[PDB]
């Protein structure tokens, strides 16, 4: 079989930059290489076929080239909606094989998050579980530290984080941290706080509530 080795694994660049990602075939594949884009939870989209030909409807800022077994995809002026995974694929021999993918992320100015907190709903509390949600909205860069404190006791092992895909227009992220407790534990304590550390904030931000407060 033929191996396709893509690099880098992750590339981050500013809007308007020229970016170049590569794909190396383990043996001769002639020009039988295509490039696909995959983003926003969608299906792969054909960009380039036969190494260098632009598929109909694909913006002209995408181009491909070949040098021996080395293949390149270049975006000449990176746009926010170009954040995506990019895959190369050879069809020279069966099985057709894919590269493992290169992720392109957009670099932009720092933006501190808006920090909000949601107590468990009274509906959920009627069951035996309490979910407390901390929301970090529309921030950059992705790195952020979110710590839970219950009655000032640092929590460990009882929260999970989820982060959105980089926004198609403003290139920000949003993040949720969900603390999960039994109803019995939730009704045992009073102060629920998430503390957010982020490059855009001049010092950490704590959002909190008291159980039972309106």
């Amino acid at each position: 079989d033929i191996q396709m080795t893509q690099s880098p694994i992750l590339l981050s660049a500013s809007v308007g930059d020229r970016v170049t990602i590569t794909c190396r075939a383990s043996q001769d594949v002639n020009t039988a290489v295509a490039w696909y884009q995959q983003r926003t939870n969608g299906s792969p989209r054909l960009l380039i076929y036969s190494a260098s030909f632009l598929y109909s409807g694909v913006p002209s800022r995408f181009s491909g080239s070949r040098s021996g077994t080395d293949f390149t995809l270049t975006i000449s002026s990176l746009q926010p909606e170009d954040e995506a995974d990019y895959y190369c694929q050879q069809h020279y021999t069966t099985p057709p094989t894919f590269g493992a993918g290169t992720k392109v992320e957009i670099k932009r100015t720092v933006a501190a998050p808006s920090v909000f907190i949601f107590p468990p709903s009274d509906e959920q509390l009627k069951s035996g579980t309490a979910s407390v949600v901390c929301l970090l909205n529309n921030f950059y860069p992705r790195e952020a530290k979110v710590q839970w404190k219950v009655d000032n006791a640092l929590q460990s092992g009882n929260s999970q984080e989820s982060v959105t895909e980089q926004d198609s227009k403003d290139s920000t992220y949003s993040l949720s941290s969900t603390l999960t407790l039994s109803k019995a534990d939730y009704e045992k304590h009073k102060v629920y706080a998430c503390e957010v550390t982020h490059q855009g904030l001049s010092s950490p931000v704590t959002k909190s509530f008291n159980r039972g407060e309106c």
Binding site: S7, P8, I9, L11, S12, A13, S14, T22, D70, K107
Partner: protein, 63 residues
Amino acid sequence: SEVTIKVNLIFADGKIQTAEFKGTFEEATAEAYRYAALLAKVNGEYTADLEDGGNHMNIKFAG
């Protein structure tokens, strides 16, 4: 083990991109240098400054 080599790509006009290469240390190293040589054909001769025992690289292109 599998490591991540983090690279700053510093272009002659001052633009900065960042990249990550993953693999064994020796594979990720080779891939980073290969990628530098490729970009140098368009962006001018490169110089690679290594930090953190080779796990971070600053790669400058002359233009």
